[PDB]
């Protein structure tokens, strides 16, 4: 639940967008296997679907490493320090290149409850609402059962 | 901190010594109030 | 658990003895060095003579530098707490003094200058076949200069300094099991003259108590 | 000349490179023996480091209840400080307020509390005026009051103290109280002193007294937090020994023709040795009086 | 004992996992954890900034002089010159000198009524140890970095920033390099305030200045509302008049603060700072 | 409601508490001086002081004869009673006995103190005593005192 | 059983460099299988947690409890090898900065009642465990203050935000 | 009557750790001038007390050797004298109790 759970809100990284866009994803780094059985949907998608991912993503590492492993995984590291795992195990090389993708569109924050659906560091143009606002003004700024020059 | 009482480091001479003074000390106060009228009384 | 029990056909072997055959007498004044001689010196010769006998491969003339390489190793075997060599390197008899006061404390040495070549002063070896087993033990003097440095168990430095360079005069006795193959000499002990100076002061200072005193007791003066 | 600050940043200066020098002068560490001489814990043997340790750590060699009971530490018979290093192996003994014949442990505390009403009177004056301290007699402790000695500026000759000034003198002295500030002590040569209190004369005259009491012209300074002034002798080891303090006595000492000299006095007892209300009060009404020493 | 091997295996990862929380492990370089190609790195970091770095210039800004020296000790320590690596001053002081130069000209140009002391703040803001290894962290640049001591020392990573910057101004001319300057150093001046960056003390003093400068008559402080004067939680609005005219209105909790944060607002005004000003434009140049 | 109660409840009854007060007493007449429970040792102090009062009226005193006969259970502190204890305390017209707290007991933790009677062989007790006229606080009221003195004599 | 409290007295830590602040001396002591309850063990243990060497033990000495005694040994003999084995200079620069009572090993004894019926008692057993840290006692803490209050209660009313808008 | 509920361990740890509950500190301790020991201002110190009672008990001892026997409760005072004492025109006609010991600095021989 919300109260179990950490929180935060909406933001961005360097403020990506708004003088160019930085795509977060850095490093996709993935383990799987020969022999295994539970790899073959990995093997499939490193034999053709990772180089045109590769091709469309210039700017993200791509490591493949085939070692004896039981569980094949990917891990995605970020611009920001944040490094994410994730199992592909008994995955069809459809929904591995589906979780790649969505790896990639990631900004790489955690996937935590957001406190309010939009961010904005200038909220107000007109001037943020204040009690003294929309009351009017007294000749010589005279206070309620005040006498003017005692 | 420690708990202390008036006689508790008073020698055996300052235990008497101080008593008569304050016994003399407050019979004099008592004995100086015996004039009300004669130490500006208030209105009557 | 002192000794095991008795009519037990496995005794216990022993690669050391407990103390020196005879302590060689430090010679006075020789901190300021640095007949009888000649029956010292026949002395000398039988031990040599002995030991020569059960192990021909043997040179006096060339033993006080692989004593110093002992003594430096055995050191640095403090040092860096090893001791499987350091048991390699001395005696059982030695081993304790050395490691028992320093097993939670750190301990920093070093062999900086050698001041006067060290030089054998007395041989002698036991009698033949105590338990089956001879040892000979050679007395040899090193005026050398070491730096130490020891810390207690939470790192603050309680004797001694690592960077100043101080003299040492000290005589190092060596033992070897000479029936045993593959018996080695070892450091065996540490001779302290009588007339050495004391050691240099400690850092902290030590309050002794006085006599204790019960209640139907009086102090005495 | 400089202002009063900067004069005693000057004397803080020298007392520090004084210090310093002894420090320097203390070869590397030397083991001394003190036996211990005093009825409880007898034949305790205190290896200590000379010219470093105290009295008060050989009291934290024994317990913290001597630490707090301990006022003055006798060594070889002689009065000594709490803080004071001790030079040379001897023999020492520990004084409190509550012993058969406490002689010097009252001495030391007068001149304590003395040095206390000088400095907080020294400091609780404007700028407008000049503070001369002169010196602080050495009335006997059954007079009721410890004095002390001080050369007004000449525009204070028809002024005199009032219930408020005694008020704020005594406030800054329970604020010195507070401040918990130790009794430093210093034993320095002649002509140090002397280029220390250059700029007083009436303490140029003390020191030059001092030596030539002293066959080895020697003076002995002692320093509370800032305040640098010197002493007829052992003093007590904290200012938070004192518990009840109150100067409420300033009395010009006639005949006026020199200078207009003014004796403030005081009346004090330890945390050890308090009092109730009543006793004070009387206490300070007799201090109240002037004390001239006989 | 129960027959199994996969539970086992699970609790002995879990155990592993509260081991490693209760006793952390020392940060380590990103090159010394696997699966780390240079060539590969550099190239995506260019990738990723979108613009035509030159390799060997990028890597003689990502080399630094302490990652020379300790080079040079280790290849004493080992007793083995081959190590003649180009060290990226030249490169640091190119791009820190084209930065500020570009910084100033995007400020004159954006706020032209800013002084000279105004300006050179915002650019020492911008250029400064906080915002430039913010930056470098962000973009990746501290694991490139090749430094002595890990973490990398946030001079070392703004002097790593700088060369980076000087590097791209030599291989893609000084056009993009300020197109990249505008995109990843003007954009942190987003959700500050003009004082919020530039500490100023005494306002009033400056907006007396000012108001010297442009020959406007001394302000008069009056005030303008009042509530809880004699309370323990008082607000009051102070207006600035020049000449009978409000120029500006602080509040605060006491009349000095009001006071104070008036002659502030007149300040922003002033200087163009407001905060319902004129949205920096990051449109492409067309 | 105890109020006005001097004397309190304790042994299996009034008989019972006079007897153990009987004993306290006859130990104390006998070894002159004994550690009891501080209410038990408080209680029979007044006994004490009273059986010194008869042993004062003397042996030829019928009264005083059947007093001690009753609370001397051991009959040759009778004798002793009426030739050297109250002889000892002749000059004095009370006070005959101290009684001073010592530290409670070790296994029960009970309040316990030491009853003696004054001018026993016995080594002497610990006493507590004033601070010497000597401190600071006891001079400073010395010279209060001369003071006060003075202005009185003149 | 565990036995990690006696451990703790041997942590070689590294030597320290010059420019470090002097680390003071701990030593933990522990007494165990100890014929007390651990409820009236705990009273005792929060009596002395924080005052001084000295202080713990005069009130254990003028404490009527059974394992006051118990502790004021355990506090002897922890004094006794901090200045020995361990490296302090003065006995009296040590408080107790930890003082606790633990559960034990206990054996179930059998009460009869009446009508046949019986109760179990165990025969309670208690560790008590201490660490003593060089130095002078740490101060107390200062009571919370009005201006304290004030101080708080203004930061609270300027952390207030605009809930659930823009 | 039967308990309704189970009490907490917050609750039992609210009684339990209850200020009158904890235990007091005691101020009245102080220091023995004479054996240098704690002690409390009204009670006597306890090595002094346990000195005088061991020396008593010596003393006690004497006098039953001297007396043999029960019911002997001599007429005339009693005088302790140590090693290196003679008696003294107060203590003739007072049974002498003799002691091999040097007499103590304390038994102050009055
Ligand atoms: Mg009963
Ligand atoms: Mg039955
Ligand atoms: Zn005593």
């Not at chain 3, 005794?11 to 407990?18: D, E, G, K, N, Q």
């Not at chain 4, 300033?250 to 209300?277: D, E, K, M, Y």
């Not at chain 5, 140890?129 to 962290?137: G, L, N, S």
């Not at chain 5, 003009?194 to 008559?217: A, D, H």
Request: hydrophobic fraction near 35%; charged fraction near 30%.
């Amino acid at each position: 639940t919300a109260r179990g759970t950490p929180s935060r809100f909406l933001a961005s990284v360097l403020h990506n967008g708004l003088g160019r866009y930085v795509q977060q994803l850095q490093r996709l780094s993935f383990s799987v296997s020969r022999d295994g059985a539970s790899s073959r949907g990995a093997r499939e998608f490193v034999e053709r679907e990772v180089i045109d991912f590769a091709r469309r993503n210039p700017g993200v590492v791509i490591y493949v490493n085939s070692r004896p492993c039981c569980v094949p995984r990917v891990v995605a590291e970020y611009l920001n320090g944040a490094v994410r795992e994730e199992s592909i195990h008994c995955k069809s090389v459809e929904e591995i290149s589906t979780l790649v993708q969505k790896l990639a569109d990631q900004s790489g924050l955690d996937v935590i409850r957001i406190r309010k659906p939009f961010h904005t560091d200038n909220p107000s143009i007109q001037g943020q609402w204040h009690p003294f606002t929309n009351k009017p003004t007294t000749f010589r700024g005279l206070r309620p059962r005040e006498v003017q020059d005692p | 901190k420690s708990g202390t009482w008036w006689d508790e480091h008073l020698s055996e001479e300052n235990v008497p010594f101080i008593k008569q003074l304050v016994s003399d000390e407050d019979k004099a106060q008592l004995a100086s109030k015996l004039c009300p009228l004669k130490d500006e009384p208030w209105p009557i | 658990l002192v000794i095991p029990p008795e009519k037990s056909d496995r005794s216990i072997h022993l690669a050391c003895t407990a103390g020196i055959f005879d302590a060689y007498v430090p010679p006075e004044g020789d901190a300021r060095i640095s007949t009888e001689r000649m029956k010292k010196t026949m002395a000398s010769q039988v031990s040599i003579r002995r030991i020569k006998d059960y192990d021909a491969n043997f040179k006096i003339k060339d033993f006080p530098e692989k004593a110093k390489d002992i003594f430096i190793e055995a050191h640095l075997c403090l040092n860096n707490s090893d001791h499987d060599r350091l048991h390699t390197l001395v005696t059982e008899h030695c081993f304790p003094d050395m490691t028992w006061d320093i097993k939670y404390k750190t301990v920093r040495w070093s062999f900086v200058e050698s001041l006067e070549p060290s030089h054998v002063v007395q041989v002698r070896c036991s009698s033949m076949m105590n338990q089956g087993n001879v040892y000979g033990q050679i007395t040899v003097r090193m005026h050398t200069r070491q730096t130490l440095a020891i810390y207690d168990r939470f790192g603050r430095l309680m004797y001694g300094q690592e960077d100043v360079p101080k003299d040492v005069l000290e005589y190092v006795v060596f033992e070897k099991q000479l029936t045993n193959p593959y018996g080695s000499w070892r450091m065996h002990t540490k001779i302290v003259p009588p007339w050495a100076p004391p050691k240099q002061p400690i850092l902290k200072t030590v309050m002794i108590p006085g006599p204790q005193l019960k209640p139907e007791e009086e102090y005495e003066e | 000349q400089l202002s009063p600050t900067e004069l005693t940043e000057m004397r803080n200066d020298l007392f520090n490179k004084e210090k310093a020098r002894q420090l320097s002068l203390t070869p590397r560490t030397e083991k001394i023996e003190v036996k211990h001489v005093g009825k409880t814990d007898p034949g305790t043997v205190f290896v200590m480091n000379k010219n470093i340790s105290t009295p008060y750590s050989c009291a934290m060699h024994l317990s913290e209840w001597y630490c707090r009971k301990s006022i003055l530490a006798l060594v070889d018979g002689q009065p000594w400080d709490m803080y004071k290093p001790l030079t040379k192996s001897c023999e020492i003994k520990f004084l409190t307020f509550k012993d058969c014949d406490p002689g010097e442990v009252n001495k030391a505390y007068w001149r304590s509390c003395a040095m206390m009403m000088g400095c907080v009177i020294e400091r609780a004056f404007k700028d407008e005026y000049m503070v001369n301290l002169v010196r602080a007699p050495e009335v006997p402790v059954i007079s009721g009051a410890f004095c002390y000695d001080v050369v007004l500026d000449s525009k204070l000759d028809e002024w005199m103290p009032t219930k408020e000034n005694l008020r704020s003198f005594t406030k800054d002295a329970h604020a010195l109280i507070y401040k918990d500030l130790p009794f430093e002590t210093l034993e320095v040569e002649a002509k140090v002193a002397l280029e220390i209190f250059q700029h007083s004369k009436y303490k140029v005259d003390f020191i030059e007294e001092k030596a030539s009491q002293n066959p080895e012209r020697i003076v002995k300074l002692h320093r509370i937090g800032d305040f640098i002034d010197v002493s007829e002798g052992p003093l007590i080891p904290r200012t938070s020994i004192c518990f009840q303090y109150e100067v409420s006595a300033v009395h010009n000492l006639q005949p006026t023709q020199p200078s207009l000299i003014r004796r403030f006095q005081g009346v004090s007892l330890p945390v050890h040795l308090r009092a109730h209300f009543t006793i004070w009060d009387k206490l300070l009404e007799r201090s109240r009086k002037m004390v001239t020493e006989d | 004992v129960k027959k199994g091997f996969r539970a086992a295996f699970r609790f002995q990862k879990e155990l592993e996992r509260q081991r490693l929380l209760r006793c952390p492990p020392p940060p380590v370089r990103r090159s010394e954890k696997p699966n780390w190609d240079y060539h590969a790195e550099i190239q995506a970091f260019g990738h990723r900034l979108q613009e035509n770095f030159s390799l060997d210039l990028l890597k003689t800004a990502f080399v630094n002089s302490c990652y020379i020296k300790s080079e040079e000790a280790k290849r004493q320590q080992l007793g083995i010159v081959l190590l003649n690596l180009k060290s990226n001053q030249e490169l640091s002081e190119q791009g820190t000198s084209f930065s500020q130069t570009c910084l100033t000209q995007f400020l004159e140009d954006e706020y032209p009524d800013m002084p000279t002391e105004g300006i050179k703040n915002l650019v020492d803001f911008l250029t400064g140890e906080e915002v430039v290894c913010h930056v470098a962290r962000n973009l990746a640049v501290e694991q490139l970095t090749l430094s002595e001591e890990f973490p990398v020392p946030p001079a070392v990573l703004q002097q790593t920033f700088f060369a980076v910057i000087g590097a791209l101004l030599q291989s893609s001319g000084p056009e993009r390099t300020a197109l990249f300057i505008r995109d990843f150093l003007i954009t942190q001046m987003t959700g500050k305030e003009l004082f919020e960056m530039w500490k100023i003390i005494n306002p009033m003093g400056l907006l007396v200045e000012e108001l010297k400068k442009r020959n406007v008559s001394a302000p008069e402080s009056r005030l303008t509302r009042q509530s809880g004067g004699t309370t323990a939680l008082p607000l009051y609005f102070v207006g600035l008049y020049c000449d009978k005219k409000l120029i500006a209105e602080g509040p605060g909790e006491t009349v000095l603060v009001a006071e104070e944060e008036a002659a502030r607002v007149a300040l922003r005004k002033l200087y163009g700072f407001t905060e319902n000003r004129r949205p920096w434009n990051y449109s492409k140049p067309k | 409601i105890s109020h006005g109660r001097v004397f309190r409840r304790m042994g299996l009854g009034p008989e019972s508490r006079i007897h153990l007060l009987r004993n306290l007493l006859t130990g104390l007449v006998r070894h002159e001086r004994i550690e009891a429970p501080w209410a038990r040792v408080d209680e029979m102090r007044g006994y004490a002081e009273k059986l010194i009062d008869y042993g004062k009226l003397g042996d030829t005193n019928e009264r005083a004869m059947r007093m001690a006969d009753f609370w001397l259970t051991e009959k040759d502190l009778i004798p002793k009673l009426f030739q050297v204890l109250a002889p000892r305390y002749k000059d004095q017209t009370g006070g005959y006995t101290r009684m001073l707290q010592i530290p409670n007991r070790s296994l029960d933790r009970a309040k316990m103190a030491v009853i003696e009677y004054k001018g026993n062989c016995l080594p002497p007790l610990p006493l507590p005593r004033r601070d010497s006229h000597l401190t600071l606080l006891n001079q400073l009221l010395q010279g209060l005192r001369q003071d006060l003195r003075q202005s009185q004599e003149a | 059983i565990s036995r990690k409290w006696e451990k703790k007295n041997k942590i070689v830590y590294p030597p320290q460099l010059p420019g470090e602040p002097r680390r003071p001396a701990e030593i933990y002591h522990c007494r165990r299988q100890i014929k007390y309850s651990k409820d009236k063990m705990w009273y005792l243990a929060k009596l002395i947690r924080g005052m001084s060497i000295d202080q713990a033990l005069a009130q254990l000495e003028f404490n009527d409890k059974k394992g006051a005694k118990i502790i004021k040994e355990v506090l002897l003999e922890a004094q006794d090898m901090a200045v020995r084995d361990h490296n302090v200079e003065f006995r009296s620069n040590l408080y107790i900065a930890e003082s606790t009572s633990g559960r034990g090993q206990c054996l179930k004894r059998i009460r009869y009642h009446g009508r046949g019926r019986f109760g179990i008692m165990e025969k309670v057993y208690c560790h008590y465990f201490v660490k003593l840290v060089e130095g002078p006692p740490p101060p107390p803490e200062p009571p919370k203050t009005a201006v304290a209050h004030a101080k708080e209660y203004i930061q609270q009313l300027r952390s207030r935000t605009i809930v659930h808008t823009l | 009557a039967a308990p309704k509920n189970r009490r907490t361990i917050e609750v039992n740890r609210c009684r339990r750790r209850n200020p009158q509950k904890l235990i007091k500190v005691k101020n009245n301790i102080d220091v023995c001038p004479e054996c240098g020991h704690l002690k409390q201002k009204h009670v006597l110190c306890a090595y002094c007390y346990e000195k005088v009672c061991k020396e008593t008990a010596e003393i006690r001892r004497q006098i039953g050797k001297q007396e043999g026997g029960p019911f002997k409760a001599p007429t005339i005072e009693t005088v302790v004298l140590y090693t290196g004492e003679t008696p003294s025109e107060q203590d003739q006609g007072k049974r002498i109790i003799e002691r091999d010991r040097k007499r103590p600095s304390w038994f102050t021989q009055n």
